[PDB]
Amino acid sequence: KLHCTERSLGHYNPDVIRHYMLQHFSPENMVFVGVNVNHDELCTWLMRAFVDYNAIPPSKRTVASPVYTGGDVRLETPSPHAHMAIAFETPGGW
Amino acid sequence: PAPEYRRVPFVKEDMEKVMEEVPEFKYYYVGKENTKGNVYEGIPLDQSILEPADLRDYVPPHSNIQYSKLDNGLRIASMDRGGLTASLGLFVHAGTRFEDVTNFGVTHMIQNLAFASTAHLSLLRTVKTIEVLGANAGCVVGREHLVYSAECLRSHMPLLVPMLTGNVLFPRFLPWELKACKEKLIMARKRLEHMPDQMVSELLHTTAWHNNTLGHKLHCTERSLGHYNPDVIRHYMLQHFSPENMVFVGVNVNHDELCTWLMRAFVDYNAIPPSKRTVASPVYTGGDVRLETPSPHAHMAIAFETPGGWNGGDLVAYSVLQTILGGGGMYTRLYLNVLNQNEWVESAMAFNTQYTDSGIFGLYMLADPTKSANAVKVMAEQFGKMGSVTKEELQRAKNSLKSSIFMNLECRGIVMEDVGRQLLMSNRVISPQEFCTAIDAVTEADIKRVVDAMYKKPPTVVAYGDVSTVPHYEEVRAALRAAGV
Amino acid sequence: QFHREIGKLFASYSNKITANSPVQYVPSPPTKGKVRRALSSALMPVWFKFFRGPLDRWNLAVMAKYLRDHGLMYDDLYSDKEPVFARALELLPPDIQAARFRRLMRGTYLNHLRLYLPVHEQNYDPFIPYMAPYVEEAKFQLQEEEELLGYHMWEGVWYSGGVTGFGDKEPGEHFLVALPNLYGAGGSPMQA
Amino acid sequence: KLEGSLLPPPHIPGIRRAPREPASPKMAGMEGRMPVRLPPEGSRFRQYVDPRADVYFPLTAVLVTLGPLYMFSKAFF
Amino acid sequence: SYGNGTVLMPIVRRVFIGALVGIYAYAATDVVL
Ligand SMILES: CCCCCCCCCCCCCCCCCC(=O)OC[C@H](COP(=O)([O-])OCC(O)COP(=O)([O-])OC[C@@H](COC(=O)CCCCCCCCCCCCCCCCC)OC(=O)CCCCCCCCCCCCCCCCC)OC(=O)CCCCCCCCCCCCCCCCC
Numbered sequence: 077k078l079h080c081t082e083r084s085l086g087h088y089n090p091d092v093i094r095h096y097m098l099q100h101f102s103p104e105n106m107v108f109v110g111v112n113v114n115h116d117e118l119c120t121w122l123m124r125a126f127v128d129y130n131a132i133p134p135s136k137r138t139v140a141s142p143v144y145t146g147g148d149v150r151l152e153t154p155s156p157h158a159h160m161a162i163a164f165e166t167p168g169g170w
Numbered sequence: 171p172a173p174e175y176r177r178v179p180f181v182k183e184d185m186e187k188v189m190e191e192v193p194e195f196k197y198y199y200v201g202k203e204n205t206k207g208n209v210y211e212g213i214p215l216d217q218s219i220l221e222p223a224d225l226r227d228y229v230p231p232h233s234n235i236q237y238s239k240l241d242n243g244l245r246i247a248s249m250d251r252g253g254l255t256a257s258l259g260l261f262v263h264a265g266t267r268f269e270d271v272t273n274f275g276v277t278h279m280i281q282n283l284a285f286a287s288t289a290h291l292s293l294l295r296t297v298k299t300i301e302v303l304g305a306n307a308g309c310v311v312g313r314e315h316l317v318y319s320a321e322c323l324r325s326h327m328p329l330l331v332p333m334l335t336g337n338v339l340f341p342r343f344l345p346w347e348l349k350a351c352k353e354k355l356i357m358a359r360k361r362l363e364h365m366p367d368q369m370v371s372e373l374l375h376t377t378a379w380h381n382n383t384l385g386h387k388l389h390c391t392e393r394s395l396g397h398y399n400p401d402v403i404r405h406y407m408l409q410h411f412s413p414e415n416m417v418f419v420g421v422n423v424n425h426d427e428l429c430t431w432l433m434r435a436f437v438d439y440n441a442i443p444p445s446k447r448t449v450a451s452p453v454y455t456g457g458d459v460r461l462e463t464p465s466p467h468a469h470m471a472i473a474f475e476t477p478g479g480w481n482g483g484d485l486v487a488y489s490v491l492q493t494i495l496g497g498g499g500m501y502t503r504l505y506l507n508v509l510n511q512n513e514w515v516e517s518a519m520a521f522n523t524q525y526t527d528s529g530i531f532g533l534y535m536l537a538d539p540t541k542s543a544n545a546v547k548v549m550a551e552q553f554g555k556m557g558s559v560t561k562e563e564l565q566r567a568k569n570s571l572k573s574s575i576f577m578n579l580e581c582r583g584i585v586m587e588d589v590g591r592q593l594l595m596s597n598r599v600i601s602p603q604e605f606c607t608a609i610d611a612v613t614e615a616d617i618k619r620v621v622d623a624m625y626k627k628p629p630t631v632v633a634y635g636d637v638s639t640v641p642h643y644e645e646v647r648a649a650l651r652a653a654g655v
Numbered sequence: 656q657f658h659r660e661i662g663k664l665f666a667s668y669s670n671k672i673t674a675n676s677p678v679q680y681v682p683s684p685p686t687k688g689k690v691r692r693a694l695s696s697a698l699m700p701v702w703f704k705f706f707r708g709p710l711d712r713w714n715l716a717v718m719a720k721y722l723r724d725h726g727l728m729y730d731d732l733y734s735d736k737e738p739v740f741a742r743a744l745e746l747l748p749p750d751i752q753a754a755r756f757r758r759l760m761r762g763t764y765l766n767h768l769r770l771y772l773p774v775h776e777q778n779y780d781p782f783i784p785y786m787a788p789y790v791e792e793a794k795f796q797l798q799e800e801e802e803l804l805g806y807h808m809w810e811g812v813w814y815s816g817g818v819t820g821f822g823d824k825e826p827g828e829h830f831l832v833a834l835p836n837l838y839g840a841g842g843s844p845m846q847a
Numbered sequence: 848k849l850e851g852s853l854l855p856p857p858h859i860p861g862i863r864r865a866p867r868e869p870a871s872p873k874m875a876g877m878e879g880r881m882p883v884r885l886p887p888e889g890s891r892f893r894q895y896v897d898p899r900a901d902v903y904f905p906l907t908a909v910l911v912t913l914g915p916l917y918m919f920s921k922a923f924f
Numbered sequence: 925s926y927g928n929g930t931v932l933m934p935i936v937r938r939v940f941i942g943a944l945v946g947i948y949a950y951a952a953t954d955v956v957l
């Protein structure tokens with residue numbers, strides 16, 4: 077899921093958060109983009125933001141392949157219409 | 171072999187003479203005639219204050235059930251045990267299994283409007299007079315039956331009969347009373363959400379009988395509020411609330427006196443006329459449903475269909491199997507083979523829910539949310555061996571079942587509900603002595619026969635609570651198929 | 656036990672009423688005596704012709720002209736501050752409630768200007784009793800409540816919970832419970 | 848046709864109609880005035896009413912009240 | 925009636941009425957009877 081649940085509130089403390097950023101927020105896993113800017117000037121100020129302090133160090137991570145299962149789910153709710161959706165898997169993605 | 175019903179004919183009586191038989195009742199006490207006070211002042215309770223004129227030679231009462239019927243078709247049955255508190259009940263064959271897409275929720279509405287204003291008595295005077303008499307009364311809705319009941323001192327029976335029958339004879343359904351009841355109509359399912367056991371049961375029914383008969387819900391929904399008007403209600407009662415579809419039962423009452431006052435409640439006014447209705451057969455589909463909710467446990471239930479239900483011919487066999495496994499004990503199969511060999515299991519049990527012509531049978535477990543995959547493997551292994559029992563297990567189960575039956579029937583309430591429920595579902599009452607004879611004739615082959623038939627249709631799977639590690643629908647089905655299920 | 660003796664007198668008079676109570680409708684007895692019902696019938700042909708008769712007819716003309724000038728019905732003159740009539744207004748269906756709302760608005764405006772309606776807007780009977788079914792049902796509801804709950808003078812905690820303790824249920828409606836708070840922003844009883 | 852402010856009701860299945868009084872004869876003395884009905888036919892009040900007395904009422908009212916008081920006061924007070 | 929706290933005015937009503945019945949009865953017995 078995208079958002080939290082009432083169960084998620086059981087681990088909403090700084091140590092859990094900081095442990096997640098140390099595994100994923102290294103510079104190698106980030107890209108910066110600008111539109112309507114001078115390229116050289118953007119590089120200079122980005123260099124100055126990182127020169128005096130230490131960034132999160134890199135880490136090797138293995139990306140697990142998704143497992144498609146399909147299935148069926150219903151959700152009743154007050155509404156005048158019956159919403160229905162049917163889908164299939166696209167191998168390989170982008 | 172149905173029971174023989176005695177006839178009670180309608181008779182026209184002078185009103186002023188029948189008033190000489192109504193029990194005394196007071197709401198106001200304007201002074202007091204007696205002026206002697208507490209004549210037992212100063213006498214301690216280790217000393218008796220009775221006189222010889224208060225002694226009698228005991229004569230046992232008539233404890234067998236007696237049967238009678240009125241001319242409009244109402245069936246009556248009562249028994250007297252000599253107690254001083256009576257139980258009264260009016261059973262109607264009009265449950266949620268008779269609703270349709272334009273009616274969902276109507277039976278729940280009728281239950282919450284019980285004891286409201288009638289043609290001859292208002293809501294306030296009805297509920298206030300019951301309280302002052304010292305009685306308790308209520309209405310309970312079900313999937314096949316609706317029941318109105320009251321309990322009171324046995325001298326107040328004539329006063330309570332009309333306040334029970336009026337709900338089905340001439341209710342008014344006033345607009346402003348319907349608008350005052352709409353609040354408590356939604357708070358039912360809301361209160362149901364925080365009751366795990368009741369939620370797992372509902373999910374089991376909705377999933378077993380998809381969109382038909384026994385799969386309809388008990389309570390209303392926000393959608394139901396679109397047809398909550400008197401015309402819809404009154405149309406439902408005209409199809410189902412005829413006297414032929416009703417039974418009245420009393421315990422600790424005089425049979426003849428109960429018939430007289432029931433006859434007097436129906437003699438001067440017209441009842442809903444009979445109608446021929448065809449009862450649709452349930453369609454069992456099985457399936458799977460999940461419901462995530464904040465909880466420390468993973469609730470899981472798996473069940474199968476029982477062909478024929480109460481009238482299928484194998485009711486006693488499923489009740490013996492339930493006793494072997496373990497219900498709600500420390501030598502049952504589930505306590506020795508499951509609980510003692512797994513410390514991460516918090517509980518486990520077997521259930522057996524039977525209706526007039528269909529039922530379900532299965533297991534129910536709580537466990538550690540991190541070992542749901544193992545909970546499924548243990549349940550499948552138990553289903554794989556259900557069709558095999560030893561002589562010691564079987565003999566110990568029979569003895570446990572017979573004792574439970576006779577012991578349950580020591581209470582007034584259970585006796586009343588059992589007699590009325592049996593006469594609507596089968597038009598006959600099976601005695602506990604006949605149950606025992608049937609229990610003793612259950613063999614090892616019968617057990618193995620009913621388990622195989624049970625497995626010829628798909629299962630019904632339910633999960634509730636923390637379902638973070640509950641396998642996929644296809645994996646549960648496959649595990650069952652590897653254990654021979 | 657002096658209280659038990661007084662209770663015996665109350666009880667004797669109580670049982671006598673019950674033993675002499677009929678079990679069906681019986682017409683009420685005439686109020687006025689025979690001596691008074693004989694003088695009236697003898698003087699009636701003269702008293703009614705020249706005084707009481709024209710008094711009745713002038714009264715209905717005065718009422719009809721005032722109501723029609725403002726476009727009102729007679730039943731519009733009753734107040735919602737009467738408990739019986741307030742309950743009756745709660746039982747009305749939408750269409751009748753809307754027409755009353757509109758007539759009351761129009762009559763306040765006409766009384767402010769002091770201008771008559773045209774004659775062709777006055778052609779109606781103002782004495783139709785459109786509230787009667789709802790008034791008689793209201794009387795029945797409130798007579799039950801009074802007999803089942805209000806038959807004794809009940810005690811209570813004094814000056815507690817915003818009420819005085821002598822029977823009031825809505826708070827702050829008597830002077831000795833005025834000014835509920837010294838600080839804060841207060842609040843509404845309808846938002847509790 | 849009908850007495851008072853009523854008109855013949857339309858026939859609509861489902862609506863039971865109460866009986867309505869028919870129109871009765873008029874009496875002398877109401878020309879030019881806003882109409883007010885007379886007592887019913889079978890009634891003692893109808894045998895005694897006369898609309899012509901309405902015109903004199905402003906004086907009759909003063910005499911029945913202030914008259915006796917003035918004579919009683921002029922005799923004993 | 926039940927539900928309100930207007931509890932003194934009904935007492936004032938019965939005292940005033942009684943007082944009036946006594947004033948006009950003490951004057952008649954002195955003038956007439
Ligand atoms: C402790 C320190 C030392 C000194 C202590 C002094 C004594 C203190 C305690 C006294 C007793 C307290 C308990 C009273 C009875 C409660 C009974 C009960 O539970 O019933 C609830 C009962 C409600 O019953 P209900 O059936 O729901 O409703 C009744 C209906 O409304 C109407 O029903 P109904 O139409 O059937 O009529 C019923 C009527 C039938 O009877 C009659 O009609 C008979 C008429 C007899 C007439 C001739 C005798 C004269 C009677 C009084 C005349 C009018 C006086 C007006 C005074 C105004 C100024 C106070 O019944 C009565 O009249 C019974 C009441 C008689 C008692 C009145 C005098 C004593 C109490 C005074 C108030 C208590 C002090 C409060 C202090 C607060 C300070 C913050 O409530 C009452 O009847 C309350 C009555 C008392 C008045 C309310 C409080 C008034 C506060 C404002 C004044 C404060 C002044 C402070 C400064 C001065 C010094 C005090």
Ligand SMILES: CCCCCCCCCCCCCCCCCC(=O)OC[C@H](COP(=O)([O-])OCC(O)COP(=O)([O-])OC[C@@H](COC(=O)CCCCCCCCCCCCCCCCC)OC(=O)CCCCCCCCCCCCCCCCC)OC(=O)CCCCCCCCCCCCCCCCC
Nearest residue numbers: 819821829830831832929930931932933934936939940943
């Ligand atoms: C606030 C926001 C703004 C900013 C802040 C402002 C700050 C300033 C505010 C004040 C702060 C300080 C606190 C002050 C507290 C004062 C006390 C208070 O609040 O009590 C309210 C309190 C009401 O409390 P409540 O919570 O609203 O309701 C109480 C119950 O729970 C429920 O009861 P209920 O609803 O059923 O009925 C209540 C009803 C109950 O009604 C009654 O019981 C009747 C009361 C009036 C009777 C007299 C009127 C005339 C009647 C006809 C004549 C009768 C003659 C006597 C014979 C009668 C037959 C035997 O009471 C009323 O109608 C209220 C009347 C207001 C009375 C206020 C007088 C206070 C004492 C000072 C008197 C000074 C008199 C000077 C003039 C005379 C000089 C010669 O009032 C009383 O009950 C006290 C009544 C006192 C009556 C005194 C009468 C004296 C004159 C008698 C006639 C003599 C004629 C002689 C002629 C001789 C010729 C030669």
